[PDB]
């Protein structure tokens, strides 16, 4: 009954040149169809590079997950500041009304996945943060319904995800 999205990695600790995966998961959100949000991460730190292992360009996408996946017509852009440590990215089911008529709302799973590899051995943040850019966010996340409607209100933002607390240094 807790309604959520949470950045979920898949490793506490990783040492340099290690690959972490940021999944983005979203629970019990209802009618979902798609979203906008806003990560932050440490340019000095984690460099985002694509399921290849390619590093993402200004452009980049974020990963595939396991739910908007289907085809609705799905719309994706991404707009990245590489320097500042900025992902921000749509991903949204644009024919609503089949999606509707299918009777099977995506309302738990992956929306999308962000790989980072580790640049430096230092305890660090991957957050997502408001932004001028995006009045209507919660914490860096906008929500949508089939409708095509903002989901306002009722979920919990679950970030910052934290690599690095304790690591693999001796000292
Ligand atoms: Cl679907
Ligand atoms: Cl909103
Ligand atoms: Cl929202």
Redesign the pocket.
Known sequence: PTSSIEIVLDKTTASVGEIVTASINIKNITNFSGCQLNMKYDPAVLQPVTSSGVAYTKSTMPGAGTILN?D?NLRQVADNDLEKGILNFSKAYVSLDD?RT?A?P?QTGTVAVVKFKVLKEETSSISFEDTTSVPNAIDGTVLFDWNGDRIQSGYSVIQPAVINLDMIKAS
């Open positions: 289907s609705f999606y299918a099977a995506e």
